[PDB]
Amino acid sequence: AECSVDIQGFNTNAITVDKSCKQFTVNLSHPGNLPKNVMGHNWVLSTAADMQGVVTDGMASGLDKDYLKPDDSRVIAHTKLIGSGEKDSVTFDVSKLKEGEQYMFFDTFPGHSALEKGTLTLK
Ligand SMILES: [Cu+2]
Ligand SMILES: [Cu+2]
Numbered sequence: 001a002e003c004s005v006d007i008q009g010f011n012t013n014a015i016t017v018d019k020s021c022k023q024f025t026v027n028l029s030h031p032g033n034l035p036k037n038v039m040g041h042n043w044v045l046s047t048a049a050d051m052q053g054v055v056t057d058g059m060a061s062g063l064d065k066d067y068l069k070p071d072d073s074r075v076i077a078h079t080k081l082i083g084s085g086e087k088d089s090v091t092f093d094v095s096k097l098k099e100g101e102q103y104m105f106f107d108t109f110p111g112h113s114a115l116e117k118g119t120l121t122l123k
Helices: 051-060
Strands: 004-008 014-017 025-030 044-047 087-093 101-106 117-122
Touching: 044 051, 051 101
Parallel strands: 004 025, 014 117
Antiparallel strands: 025 087, 044 101, 101 117
């Protein structure tokens, strides 16, 4: 089945990964005209349980860490932080994913998590 998804930064509020896929790719795109540094976006994947932890410590860490705490072991996958006309794409092992667990995708650029947030599920 398909196992890439195109996301603009969110047009989708919800991703489902086909249980039959071995890998999965998120192509992320930035729509506007502003520098990564005043209006950059990422796509981060953690379990719902961990989302808020990744976000707050990611805010605390700088632009220079792409707004993610270094060695954050609760982050399953993510795209680089990106700005205007920059695109990024992350490909992860689907074996990292457990059917019947609730995952969240989100943006860790300060504040964007309240609107740029979604659900991903292995099904
Ligand atoms: Cu397939
Ligand atoms: Cu954003």
